[PDB]
Every structure is written in structure tokens, then in C-alpha cells.
Ligand binder design. Structure first.
Ligand SMILES: CCOC[C@@H](Oc1cc(C[C@@H]2CS(=O)(=O)C[C@H](NCc3cccc(C(C)(C)C)c3)[C@H]2O)cc(F)c1N)C(F)(F)F
Length: 375
């Protein structure tokens, strides 16, 4: 039941959201990063300074070596390993066990994060972007093929963990309307942004710029990442709105903290960002609104805990727009693979203060009939 699946995610700020999984027979328990931005299932399989535990293939009598190596370079972080298959379950997910491809990570560089409490990654996107190539069936494809669980999952990520509901939509997790944007191509979860506003002010760019060279929904990525030209415009606009206070250059590069005395964070001086997503109907769109409570990410370090400190969680990208965790937080996001669309609604843990609230609103109509896809 979906009720059993609620609150099955945990996480630390800036360190992803993970779900408990078991691999092998007898089951070995691991925490696994939920990542809609990749398509490989991979687990630590040898000692590493940042690993609390790892997958021991020799103790699983159901493990099969595929006799193939694999290497995955992310934007930040990389690992290499050996491919195999084994039995996998999700204790607080569907009540099924399936045989899936698993990469056993034997060497890595800046992949594992000290203290994150996860030991592997679950790539939930499509085979087209799997390594070594698209012939390696991703986990979710295996799950659907072997169990006839409906071809859909949803994520409710909550900020300072959340729920991954497999096989359907849990209405207890959102309010208001669920708005759908088409998946443009089944590789990443690619979507189209048709308009961007900062505090109600249109950035006024050709809408193709927002999607150079793609826009994706990516739960494994912390920040909102924007194409260079869009990032520069966004920062200028956010700077203009918050000009009553000055921040270090390092802050806007996402590197340095800004801190305020406990409870005094001036949320009002920071603008709301509206991302308008292509709708299911021609030239219609809906917007999701992003508050500073989302794009100023709280740090949870005990050493900094006397005050409220934040990192600027918007970053420049060279590989397109990435709608990462800080964007997904507070929304219920439905990955409706069966109907090739992604849904957004305000979730039960949506961000708000007395003046403003995260929202999903539509429909909006645009006069210009240009296709915003970069292609
Ligand atoms: C930097 C730490 O952030 C915290 C971050 O940790 C990681 C998260 C990921 C998943 C990545 C994060 S990313 O920023 O690299 C974008 C990428 N999705 C798009 C993409 C870009 C490039 C290549 C590919 C492939 C896999 C299709 C080849 C896919 C995701 O999957 C890999 C890592 F190693 C680490 N640690 C977390 F903790 F999860 F929040």
C-alpha cells in the first residue's frame, strides 16, 4: 500500500535523499541515493573511507557476474566497477523482489560523500543514458517488466525526509491541482521551460535559451542549475531585488555561506522565481513558484548552528537546465512514464511564510508559437 511507502526517504541537506534497499541473498541492507538524473544502479562494493558498509558479492548466492566493466562520469564525481545481476528489494516500497543489473563500485573519485549515510545510487531515468550503453536495463524497467507494478513513480522530497511512491499517486501527499508537462524525450526526464520570471518580471529571453541544451528533472542534484546566459540574468535580477543587503561574490558562486542571527533571515528581500513549464496542450503552460526558502539552502553543520546559515543553491550549468532537489522540494512530483509526462502539485510539506507560498498554477497562454525545445 502507498500508506506503507510514506516517509520512506531520508536525507541530509545538500547530501541527497536516500531509500533503504536490499541486494543479494541473504539480503544485504544498504541506503541508496534516489537519482532521477541517471540510469545506473550502483553500490559500493569495496572498502572506502566514507563507506559505513558495502555490498559483499561473495556472500550472495544469487549474484551473477556479467563479465563486463562499467564507468560512470557524473558532472561531479565518478566511479568504476564490475557489472552483475542480483536480487533487489525495497523494504518500504513495493512488496516484490526483482533481479536487476547492479554495478559493483570498486574505485571512485568524489562520488561518495562523507557522512551522507548512503552507499549507492539508484538511477531512475531511461536506458538511453545508461552506461556502458543503452543495452543495460535500468532498475525501474526491470521492476515493471518482472512485477507488473504500474509504470509510474512519484517523489515527495521535503526540506529541513520524504516519500517515494512506486506504482501510483498518493493523494494524501498533495493539495490542489496536479499539472502535467510532457516528457520531451525518454532519456533524462527532459522537459521544456517556456518562460522564467523573477518576482513577476519576465527575463525576456528567447525561450530556447532556457532549454540549452536540455532541461531535466534531477533528484540527485542539489541545486537549480541554469545555462550560462540564464544564470547571469537570474543572478542580476536576484541581486537587484535583494540590494538592500550586500553579499560576498563567493556567495553568488554558491561556495560561501551567508548567516543571519537566529530567526532573522530577511526572506522578504529575496524574490520568488517562477518557472513556466510546457503544458500538455499547445502553447499552454503552468508555473511552479520557487521561494528563497528553497533556493537558499540551509546548512545543518553543528559548528554553524548558533545562527541561520545558507548557501545559494542556484548554479551555472554548461549542460543545460537542471531542476534539482531544491526545486523539487515542497512539490509532489509524478513521474508518469506510462503517459510520458511529469506532474507537479503542491505537496504536504510545501514551503511558505506569512506572505508567500510555493505554488503550482495554470493554465497560462503564450502568443508566440515558437517551439521552446532546443533539440
Ligand atoms: C557534487 C555532490 O552533490 C551532492 C549529491 O551527490 C552526488 C550526486 C550524483 C548524481 C548526479 C549529480 S550531477 O550534478 O552530476 C547531475 C547528474 N545528472 C545529469 C548527468 C550529468 C552528467 C552525466 C550523467 C550520466 C550518469 C548519464 C553519465 C548525468 C546526477 O546523476 C553523483 C555523485 F557523485 C554525487 N556525489 C547528492 F548528495 F546526491 F545530493
Amino acid at each position: 500500500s502507498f500508506v506503507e511507502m510514506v516517509d520512506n526517504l531520508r536525507g541530509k541537506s545538500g547530501q541527497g535523499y536516500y531509500v533503504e534497499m536490499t541486494v543479494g541473498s541473504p539480503p544485504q541492507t544498504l541506503n541508496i541515493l534516489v537519482d532521477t538524473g541517471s540510469s545506473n544502479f550502483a553500490v559500493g562494493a569495496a572498502p572506502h573511507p566514507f563507506l559505513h558498509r558495502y555490498y559483499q558479492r561473495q556472500l550472495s548466492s544469487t549474484y551473477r557476474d556479467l563479465r563486463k566493466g562499467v564507468y560512470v562520469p557524473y558532472t561531479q564525481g565518478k566511479w568504476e566497477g564490475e557489472l552483475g545481476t542480483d536480487l533487489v528489494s525495497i523494504p518500504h516500497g513495493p512488496n516484490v523482489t526483482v533481479r536487476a543489473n547492479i554495478a559493483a563500485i570498486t574505485e571512485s573519485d568524489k562520488f561518495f560523500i562523507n557522512g551522507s549515510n548512503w552507499e549507492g545510487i539508484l538511477g531512475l531515468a531511461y536506458a538511453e543514458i545508461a552506461r556502458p550503453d543503452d543495452s543495460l536495463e535500468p532498475f525501474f524497467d526491470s521492476l515493471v517488466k518482472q512485477t507488473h507494478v504500474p509504470n509510474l513513480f512519484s517523489l515527495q522530497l521535503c526540506g529541513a525526509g520524504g516519500s517515494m511512491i512506486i506504482g501510483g499517486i498518493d493523494h494524501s501527499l498533495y493539495t490542489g491541482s496536479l499539472w502535467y508537462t510532457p516528457i520531451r524525450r525518454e532519456w533524462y526526464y527532459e522537459v521544456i521551460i517556456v518562460r522564467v520570471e523573477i518576482n513577476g518580471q519576465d527575463l525576456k529571453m528567447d525561450c530556447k535559451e532556457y532549454n540549452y541544451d536540455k532541461s531535466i528533472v534531477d533528484s540527485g542534484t542539489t541545486n537549480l542549475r541554469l545555462p550560462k546566459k540564464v544564470f547571469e540574468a537570474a543572478v542580476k535580477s536576484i541581486k537587484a531585488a535583494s540590494s538592500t543587503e550586500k553579499f560576498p561574490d563567493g556567495f553568488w558562486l554558491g561556495e560561501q555561506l551567508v548567516c543571519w542571527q537566529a530567526g532573522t533571515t530577511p526572506w522578504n528581500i529575496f524574490p520568488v522565481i517562477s518557472l513556466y513549464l510546457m503544458g500538455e496542450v499547445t502553447n499552454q503552460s503552468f508555473r511552479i513558484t520557487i521561494l528563497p526558502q528553497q533556493y537558499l539552502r540551509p546548512v545543518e553543520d553543528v559548528a554553524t548552528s548558533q545562527d541561520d546559515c545558507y548557501k545559494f543553491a542556484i548554479s551555472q550549468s554548461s549542460t543545460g537546465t537542471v531542476m534539482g532537489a531544491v526545486i523539487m522540494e515542497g512539490f509532489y512530483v509524478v513521474f508518469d512514464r506510462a503517459r510520458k509526462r511529469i506532474g507537479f502539485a503542491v505537496s504536504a510539506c510545501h514551503v511558505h511564510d506569512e506572505f508567500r507560498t510555493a505554488a503550482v498554477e495554470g493554465p497560462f497562454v503564450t502568443l508566440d508559437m515558437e517551439d521552446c525545445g532546443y533539440n
